[PDB]
């Protein structure tokens, strides 16, 4: 709160200084006077023509030649014409090629494709634990598995327990699956990669599986990183069916994801937070415990848990403080965490409809009912049939 506001005063000064400071250091004042430094800048200009073509490096051989696929025309058997060495290079990377003679000038860019641009939401959310509407215990499970081995190896080594390679979140939905993933991701201050599962489904032949493996490669260069696979079930076990080009597609993208996460052992290269809105009616072919160890199940909030979600919320709000928090919760019946959030938002909006500016005790009571009604109409009510 106070602390959060203070950090901003330092950051305002920081932007101004950093932009001036950048200039003297980067060059044109630290202009290459060094044999090594000058040689790389001058040589790449001379070899380079314009246009160029991007490629992805398909495999390298140890005799100073490599094989690349360029975006345009055929693949090329290219030589390593100066610059980068063999070690520097790895397959699955994107490298820059001159059209005049396709050769690897280098990478230092952690790839560059249109694919990578979508993947890198790299700059962290402001979202962080206990800025979330969440349950105290539930966030602290996500942190224990994903975050904690990097932060303190101390506890994990003494105890003698094995570090995982990801975790999985599954619903009952409306539990802040995505909110949790964003909270942890800010805390590490490691690069946050994101992709949605449907993007990986396509009606083109073979494109999907390249992207699925690609997520792990991009992340590895950036590493440490946390890779957010939003709605895994989408590539997986939720239908694209068998009559739209799904018949081939789904099985391949699903399988491709499942084998690397599994490996031959739990690899532990880069951490993963996987969010799913259910694994409840969907088919088996997904990652099981003991590669990602802990699998986190959410409940449907009870009276006691509802205290933790609500107290966080009442602070931004007002005039539900007058009335005891305990009594309000008791009164309302059991609902999911998104529903609880929705009541509270709706309280602020309904006052405006009433001709009032913002939440009152009365507005808070009515909002509870409206959401409850939607659910009560949608699915079974009270007393048996």
């Amino acid at each position: 709160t106070q602390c959060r506001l203070k950090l901003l005063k330092l950051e305002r000064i920081k932007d101004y200084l950093l932009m001036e400071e950048e200039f003297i250091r980067n060059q044109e004042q630290m202009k290459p006077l060094e044999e090594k430094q000058e040689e790389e800048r001058s040589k790449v200009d001379d070899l380079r023509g314009t246009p160029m073509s991007v490629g992805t490096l398909e495999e390298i051989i140890d005799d100073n030649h490599a094989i690349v696929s360029t975006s345009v025309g055929s693949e090329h058997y290219v030589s390593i014409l100066s610059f980068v060495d063999k070690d520097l290079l790895e397959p699955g990377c994107s490298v820059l090629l001159n059209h005049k003679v396709h050769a690897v000038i280098g990478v230092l860019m952690d790839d560059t494709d249109p694919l990578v641009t979508v993947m890198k939401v790299e700059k962290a959310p402001q979202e962080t634990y206990a800025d979330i509407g969440g349950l105290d215990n539930q966030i602290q499970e996500i942190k224990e598995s994903v975050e904690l081995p990097l932060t303190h190896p101390e506890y994990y080594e003494e105890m003698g327990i094995k570090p995982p390679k990801g975790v999985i979140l599954y619903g009952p939905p409306g539990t802040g699956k995505t909110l949790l993933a964003k909270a942890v991701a800010n805390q590490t201050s490691a690069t946050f990669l994101r992709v949605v599962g449907s993007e990986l489904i396509q009606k083109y032949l073979g494109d999907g599986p390249k992207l699925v493996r690609e997520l792990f490669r991009v992340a590895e260069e950036h590493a440490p990183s946390i890779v957010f696979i939003d709605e895994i079930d989408a590539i997986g076990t939720k239908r694209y069916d068998s009559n739209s080009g799904g018949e081939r597609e789904i099985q391949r993208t699903m399988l491709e994801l499942l084998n690397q996460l599994d490996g031959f052992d739990s690899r532990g290269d880069v951490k993963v937070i996987m969010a799913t809105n259910r694994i409840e009616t969907l088919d088996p072919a997904l990652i099981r415990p003991g590669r990602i160890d802990r699998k986190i199940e959410f409940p449907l909030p009870d009276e006691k848990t509802k205290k933790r979600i609500f107290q966080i919320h009442t602070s931004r709000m007002t005039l539900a403080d007058d009335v005891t928090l305990d009594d309000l919760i008791m009164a309302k019946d059991d609902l999911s965490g998104a529903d609880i959030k929705a009541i509270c938002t709706e309280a602020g909006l309904m006052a405006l409809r009433e001709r009032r500016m913002k939440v009152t005790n009365e507005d808070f009571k009515k909002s509870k009912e409206n959401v409850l009604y939607k659910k009560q109409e949608g699915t079974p009510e009270g007393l048996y049939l």
Binding site: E20, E21, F23, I24, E28, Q29, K31
Partner: protein, 73 residues
């Protein structure tokens, strides 16, 4: 006596190429250092600060070149 005089020794082409390189180093370093440095708090009763230790904020320099207006006479 001063309206037709002996014009200066030349700028020349030679010196023109040579100078830019020299000017380049001084130019980025001065600007980068001078603009960034503050030693001021503007929400203070004081205007800047009574001077604690000496500042590096500093100022720039201007030198024009002498010419007199449009005439051929």
């Amino acid at each position: 006596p001063s309206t037709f005089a002996y014009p200066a020794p030349l700028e020349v082409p030679k010196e023109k190429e040579k100078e830019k390189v020299s000017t380049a180093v001084l130019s980025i370093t001065a600007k980068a250092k001078k603009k960034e440095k503050e030693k001021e708090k503007k929400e203070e009763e004081k205007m800047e600060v009574d001077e604690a230790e000496k500042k590096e904020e500093k100022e720039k320099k201007k030198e024009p070149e002498p010419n007199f207006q449009l005439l051929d006479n």
